[PDB]
Amino acid sequence: ASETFEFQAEITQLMSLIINTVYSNKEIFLRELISNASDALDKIRYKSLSDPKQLETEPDLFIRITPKPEQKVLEIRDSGIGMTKAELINNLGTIAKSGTKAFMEALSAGADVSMIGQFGVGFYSLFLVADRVQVISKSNDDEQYIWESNAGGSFTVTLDEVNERIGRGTILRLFLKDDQLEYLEEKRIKEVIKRHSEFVAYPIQLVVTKEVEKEEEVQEIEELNKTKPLWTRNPSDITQEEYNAFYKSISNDWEDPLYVKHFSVEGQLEFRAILFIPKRAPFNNIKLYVRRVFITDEAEDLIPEWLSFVKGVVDSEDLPLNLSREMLQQNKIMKVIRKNIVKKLIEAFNEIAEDSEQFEKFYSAFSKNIKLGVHEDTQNRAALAKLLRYNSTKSVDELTSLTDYVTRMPEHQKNIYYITGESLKAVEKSPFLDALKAKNFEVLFLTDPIDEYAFTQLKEFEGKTLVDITKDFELEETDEEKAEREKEIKEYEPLTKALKEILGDQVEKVVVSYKLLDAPAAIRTGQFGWSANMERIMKAQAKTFEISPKSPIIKELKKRVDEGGAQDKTVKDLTKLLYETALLTSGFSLDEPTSFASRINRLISLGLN
Amino acid sequence: ASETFEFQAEITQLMSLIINTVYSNKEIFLRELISNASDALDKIRYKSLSDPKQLETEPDLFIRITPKPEQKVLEIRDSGIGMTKAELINNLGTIAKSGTKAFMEALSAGADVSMIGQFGVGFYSLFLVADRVQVISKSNDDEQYIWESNAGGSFTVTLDEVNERIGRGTILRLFLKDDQLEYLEEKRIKEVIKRHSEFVAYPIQLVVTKEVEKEEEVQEIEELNKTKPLWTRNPSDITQEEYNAFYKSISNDWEDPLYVKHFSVEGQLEFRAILFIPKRAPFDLFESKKKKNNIKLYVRRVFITDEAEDLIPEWLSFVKGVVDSEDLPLNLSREMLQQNKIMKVIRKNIVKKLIEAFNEIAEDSEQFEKFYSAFSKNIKLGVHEDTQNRAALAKLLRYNSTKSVDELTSLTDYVTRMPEHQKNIYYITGESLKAVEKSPFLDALKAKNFEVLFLTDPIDEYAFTQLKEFEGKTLVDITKDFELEETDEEKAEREKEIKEYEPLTKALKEILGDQVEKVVVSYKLLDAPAAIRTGQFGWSANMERIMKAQAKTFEISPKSPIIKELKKRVDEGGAQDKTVKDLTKLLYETALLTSGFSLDEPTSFASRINRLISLGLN
Amino acid sequence: WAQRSSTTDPERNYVLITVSIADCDAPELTIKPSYIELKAQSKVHHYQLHIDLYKEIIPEKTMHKVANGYFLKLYKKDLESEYWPRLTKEKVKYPYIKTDFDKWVDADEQDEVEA
Amino acid sequence: WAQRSSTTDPERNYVLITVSIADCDAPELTIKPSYIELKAQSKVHHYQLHIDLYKEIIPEKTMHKVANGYFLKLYKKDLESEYWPRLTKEKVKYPYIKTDFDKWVDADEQDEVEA
Ligand SMILES: Nc1ncnc2c1ncn2[C@@H]1O[C@H](COP(=O)(O)OP(=O)(O)OP(=O)(O)O)[C@@H](O)[C@H]1O
Numbered sequence A: 001a002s003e004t005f006e007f008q009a010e011i012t013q014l015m016s017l018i019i020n021t022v023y024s025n026k027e028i029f030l031r032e033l034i035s036n037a038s039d040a041l042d043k044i045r046y047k048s049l050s051d052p053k054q055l056e057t058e059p060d061l062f063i064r065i066t067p068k069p070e071q072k073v074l075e076i077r078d079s080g081i082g083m084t085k086a087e088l089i090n091n092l093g094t095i096a097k098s099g100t101k102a103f104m105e106a107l108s109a110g111a112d113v114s115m116i117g118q119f120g121v122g123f124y125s126l127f128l129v130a131d132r133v134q135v136i137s138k139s140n141d142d143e144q145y146i147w148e149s150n151a152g153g154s155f156t157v158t159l160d161e162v163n164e165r166i167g168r169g170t171i172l173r174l175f176l177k178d179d180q181l182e183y184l185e186e187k188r189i190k191e192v193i194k195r196h197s198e199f200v201a202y203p204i205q206l207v208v209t210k211e212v213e214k215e216e217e218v219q220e221i222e223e224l225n226k227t228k229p230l231w232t233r234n235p236s237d238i239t240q241e242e243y244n245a246f247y248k249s250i251s252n253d254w255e256d257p258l259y260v261k262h263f264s265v266e267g268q269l270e271f272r273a274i275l276f277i278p279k280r281a282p283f284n285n286i287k288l289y290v291r292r293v294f295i296t297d298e299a300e301d302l303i304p305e306w307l308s309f310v311k312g313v314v315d316s317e318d319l320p321l322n323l324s325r326e327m328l329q330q331n332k333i334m335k336v337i338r339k340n341i342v343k344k345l346i347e348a349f350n351e352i353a354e355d356s357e358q359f360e361k362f363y364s365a366f367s368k369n370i371k372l373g374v375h376e377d378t379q380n381r382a383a384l385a386k387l388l389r390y391n392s393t394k395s396v397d398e399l400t401s402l403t404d405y406v407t408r409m410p411e412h413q414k415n416i417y418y419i420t421g422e423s424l425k426a427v428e429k430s431p432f433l434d435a436l437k438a439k440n441f442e443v444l445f446l447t448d449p450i451d452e453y454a455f456t457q458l459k460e461f462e463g464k465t466l467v468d469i470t471k472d473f474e475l476e477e478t479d480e481e482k483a484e485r486e487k488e489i490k491e492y493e494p495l496t497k498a499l500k501e502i503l504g505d506q507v508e509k510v511v512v513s514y515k516l517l518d519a520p521a522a523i524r525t526g527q528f529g530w531s532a533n534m535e536r537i538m539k540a541q542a543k544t545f546e547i548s549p550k551s552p553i554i555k556e557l558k559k560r561v562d563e564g565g566a567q568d569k570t571v572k573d574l575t576k577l578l579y580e581t582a583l584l585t586s587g588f589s590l591d592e593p594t595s596f597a598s599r600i601n602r603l604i605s606l607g608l609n
Numbered sequence B: 001a002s003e004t005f006e007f008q009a010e011i012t013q014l015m016s017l018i019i020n021t022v023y024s025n026k027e028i029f030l031r032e033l034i035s036n037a038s039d040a041l042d043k044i045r046y047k048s049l050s051d052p053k054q055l056e057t058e059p060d061l062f063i064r065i066t067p068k069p070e071q072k073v074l075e076i077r078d079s080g081i082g083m084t085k086a087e088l089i090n091n092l093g094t095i096a097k098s099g100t101k102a103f104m105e106a107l108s109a110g111a112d113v114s115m116i117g118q119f120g121v122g123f124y125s126l127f128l129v130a131d132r133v134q135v136i137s138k139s140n141d142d143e144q145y146i147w148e149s150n151a152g153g154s155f156t157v158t159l160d161e162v163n164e165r166i167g168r169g170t171i172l173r174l175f176l177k178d179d180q181l182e183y184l185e186e187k188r189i190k191e192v193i194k195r196h197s198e199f200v201a202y203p204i205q206l207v208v209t210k211e212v213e214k215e216e217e218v219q220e221i222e223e224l225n226k227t228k229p230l231w232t233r234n235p236s237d238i239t240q241e242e243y244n245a246f247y248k249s250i251s252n253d254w255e256d257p258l259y260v261k262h263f264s265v266e267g268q269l270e271f272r273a274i275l276f277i278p279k280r281a282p283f284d285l286f287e288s289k290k291k292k293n294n295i296k297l298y299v300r301r302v303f304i305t306d307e308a309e310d311l312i313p314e315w316l317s318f319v320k321g322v323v324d325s326e327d328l329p330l331n332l333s334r335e336m337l338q339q340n341k342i343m344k345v346i347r348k349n350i351v352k353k354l355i356e357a358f359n360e361i362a363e364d365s366e367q368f369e370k371f372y373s374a375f376s377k378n379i380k381l382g383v384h385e386d387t388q389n390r391a392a393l394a395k396l397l398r399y400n401s402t403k404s405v406d407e408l409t410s411l412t413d414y415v416t417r418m419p420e421h422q423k424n425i426y427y428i429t430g431e432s433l434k435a436v437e438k439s440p441f442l443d444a445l446k447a448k449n450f451e452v453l454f455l456t457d458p459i460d461e462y463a464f465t466q467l468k469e470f471e472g473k474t475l476v477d478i479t480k481d482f483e484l485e486e487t488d489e490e491k492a493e494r495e496k497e498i499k500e501y502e503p504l505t506k507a508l509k510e511i512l513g514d515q516v517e518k519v520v521v522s523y524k525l526l527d528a529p530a531a532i533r534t535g536q537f538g539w540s541a542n543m544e545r546i547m548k549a550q551a552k553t554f555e556i557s558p559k560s561p562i563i564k565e566l567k568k569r570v571d572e573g574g575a576q577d578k579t580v581k582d583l584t585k586l587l588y589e590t591a592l593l594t595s596g597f598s599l600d601e602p603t604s605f606a607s608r609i610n611r612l613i614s615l616g617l618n
Numbered sequence C, D: 001w002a003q004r005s006s007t008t009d010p011e012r013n014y015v016l017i018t019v020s021i022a023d024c025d026a027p028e029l030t031i032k033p034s035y036i037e038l039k040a041q042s043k044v045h046h047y048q049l050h051i052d053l054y055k056e057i058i059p060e061k062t063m064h065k066v067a068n069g070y071f072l073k074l075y076k077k078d079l080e081s082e083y084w085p086r087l088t089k090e091k092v093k094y095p096y097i098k099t100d101f102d103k104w105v106d107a108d109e110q111d112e113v114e115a
């Protein structure tokens, strides 16, 4: 035996919900009212396609702020469609009833929706800053009716008998909470609109009486100006001077954007986007708009860290939904827009790539951020790979990518060779790897530390391996010394282990290989093991000993092996000394940096004294 | 001629507003229902102070989840107060009407409010995951009435004729949207509750049919268990084993919290807080800013958000904690205060309070070093990134010294170790402990009857920067130094005796050309050949070595036996040279690395070394 | 003769559709091979809807039901791993067709079952 | 005989108070040296309120007005630079007295004039 009942939420409370539900960001009343006012003009404007007699009443489509401090009142004039008696009553019962119905059923053979805004609350948010409201509307469908409330449970409607008539539309009177007078301030209204409601379809008019009194000069202003949405027009319909002039306005910048990428995506997302690579780096960008109104701005949702610098802007009609007006809330949306703003933005580099110098202008700016992107990506790693530019022993005073290095190497090679360290010249003409220089291959120069912090994640570039320092072998080569290798190295075999002992446990094996000519000694970090330079960096931010036989200072060792082996007296300050010398030679750290210096001055003691 | 009218928002829409207004975080329905269920028990419980006959109907105060997949239904049993016919009708018209009125006017001579929750919407949020709802309530004020809706503009009320009776309270039947069956899952409900509604005043019961039958055995479970809110009880009423047992539950940790700081603040904020210094550092990173968020915040028992950088400055990261206020900072519908002025204040305290907590751990021999081996960094980090607490934080630093090697030392000890004849604190830094320790770098400061610290960590110098005034005392070294008369005996000869090396001074400045600024021969050294002091008001050589790593003045010892040779050869060779080419630069380069310096020009140096084995031993 | 609002949402093998009105009665079933039609009135506003599909559905394996206060519908496509740029077969400046971001994902259809 | 909800908020020299009901008529003024009282009914629920102050106000320089749908009140203290830990003079487990964080600040009263 049932009994159905009708939901009946109650107002007093529901209001105080909307208004007082906090939002320590209460400037939105303006945004919301404007939006609600755009909505209105947008309505009459469309209504003229088939009947432009409707427009006669007021030929202009605009909104006009009018601060009247004298009675502490904020007027918002609009020449939109305005409401009839019933259109006030009906449409001003919360949430339900919205100027959406008006577009819900449009279905038109053109069907243009410059205007969006539902929920049907945004109006009430005026009470956030207004104690009482005064709505005066005139639609060329009824007379001038006045709708007045005080956020109560009730509202009043009266025919305006005395009070200046208006052609068509609505005027909003705000009587601000006795402190909210911040909103009668010129700068403040400019601050608010010219940041929340900048890119509206309508002129954003603001009266501002100035001061002329010597014994007032009003000015209808801020058609400024310097508003217009550069993503609403066809790319072709813009060139430089228009894209860059935009950038400057949206990013308080002084220099010209190095590049720019207008574009859209469609399907079921449907969003447009302009994005700029700036001329210089500095020491939150891609401001996001839905249907012309500012939503949020952000970094790490749309744009990965390393693309930071990219100043931009996005816009969708297909309102990602938003809990009452400040973020999508569905970060699956987020992820997608990210993919694109990357894929699209990458080809944009790939475009700037097709250039001699304007790339190096970009590469002097964002060498880092690209390298950074290599490290922190995966999918685009390879896409990003080609975009790197280093030096080489083949091209010193000259930039080089990697797609050039691949073509420079013969078929007899399969691994890309690179070294890194302190500086450009702190490796350049350094006989560290002279027996790779004279080994008919090629090595890069990675002065930045970040470089190696990326190269890490690339031990497979186009099948090619990345390798530095090091271990190597080759066939025969000229089966002549080859032939003596075992026999001649065996000459230094009573010297081999002897040298392995006075240094004890740090090395693994002490070899005397001909992969060197006259430079005394070398320290090749073992194969399948991090480079000495790699170490110097992987350690900076947190082993095998080679001897040149034909070196004049090493033949002395073979003689003294007989004149002193296991221990020594004069060859104590020497045995370790050269080991420590060849250490720094192999791009190495100041490991034990005080004992070495002391040997140096200690071996000025016998020679010149 | 006016005409007043009555606002009349309309429902169909207003609902779809609440539910569909997004919140890509739709688990809250549960949180909200439980909250609404706590609210209920909280209500009857208090109602028993003056009449505990009301409790007879059901002696237990609890809530019981009961997933029934077979008909795709999520039941929420509660033994709270339950509603009468009219209490369903009335209180289920949106927003207005809330079980708040019940507490709005309490005013009581004790007046306890375990229970908060207004807005009067939270209920409707069930439709986020439920297609149709089934409310069955029984209050010991009426019979068993059934209230049923489908998020429509309408709801039905009927007297429950057949369907198991209940003692007192309410049961909620959720018929989930044909995919939301994620919520019939054991693990999921455990995930949700035991994370959103963990610290309720009531047992959080959950049926989970699970069988051990040989090929059903229900089990009223999860009274589990140290749910309980350790901030609601007096500090004195807790010691170790209770604080630490809490820590372990709220931070899935295995070791005991080194320390703990319970406390509150009152006035117009009114919030309580427990905070723990853990035994060990994670060990993860960190300043990725990607990870941190340990201090979980609750208002009136319910979980709100958890965060880092609003309450807790970066460097205090590690401090696992928890905050709670009754004085509900307000919140747009239940996920953050929204008024970050609040935030700032709680931050001040959670710092001030948390600082003294170190200052307490400070009063200790070894349990401090156990803490100092853990967070040496984070303190130092705090020195750099603060200002106000800089000094408060200053005292908390512990280094080595030439006075105490195998021994910790603060700074408030160094101030008392220095005579009145000194006004500046002296410190050096570099590679390692021993890579400076017995190093005659500053032996003529050691034997100058003062004291120098040892700053092995790079971060150290990255803080000391911001402290050129510690208790009036200046911080110094590598850089540049001066002192008064010192024994006005070799003050007296300084000008005369340095002038001995003045024809040697400029000569040495030339073969090295333009890198140095001035080549001086100062007695701030004894027998170590040469030194490279980076000029004052300029970054350290070691500082450089690092500020550069990730992206000048030349001192000579006069009494050095290898330098007296220079004065002789000045006469036997000046402006140019033949044999003293591989030498002039060589020692400059030697004394370079000596002054914590980079391998600047690292190939030419090595070549000099082996090139000066050529005449001596050949 | 009013118009309810609607909802695109491709996945792997299907498209689903959320209408929108309170307590609608007599749901008008019309499962045309390439078309969809419904004339359900709400408990008065009479709602009617017709839409030309973008591709060929399967009028065979499709379920229509009502949830609460919106009508839901669902159908399998005629392919394997493709993705509709719209629901209709025209110029979509359709006011009342909007995307259901709740169910919408694409690009990561069966590729979001991941830790 | 219902009870309206309320609002603490010290600043430099004053305390202000926000009540809460719709369209209340006949606001019952009571400016006791240490007490506040109001019996205003709303357009029916009859609301009454009394509170013992924490300190001595100034019944002399105080304005009471109505805003909309809440009653507002305001008064100067008897000191220079001090700060009330409550509004009443008792054990504040008062359900209906809650803080107005909108106007609340303290600690930084005249101490927020920068950027
Ligand atoms: N400038 C205006 N001219 C005419 N009518 C207006 C104006 N501003 C608001 N309205 C009225 O407000 C109603 C709904 O607006 P409201 O702001 O309350 O919600 P909304 O604008 O539909 O959506 P939102 O809540 O997102 O703004 C419309 O139906 C319309 O009658």
Ligand SMILES: Nc1ncnc2c1ncn2[C@@H]1O[C@H](COP(=O)(O)OP(=O)(O)OP(=O)(O)O)[C@@H](O)[C@H]1O
Binding pocket: B032, B035, B036, B037, B039, B040, B078, B080, B081, B082, B083, B091, B092, B095, B097, B098, B099, B100, B116, B117, B118, B119, B120, B121, B122, B123, B124, B137, B169, B170
């Ligand atoms: N389990 C319950 N037992 C008895 N009464 C209940 C129960 N749940 C809700 N109510 C009644 O219905 C309302 C609770 O649902 P509501 O949506 O208002 O949530 P609320 O907790 O009141 O406020 P919110 O949940 O928005 O913080 C209260 O007014 C209360 O009187």
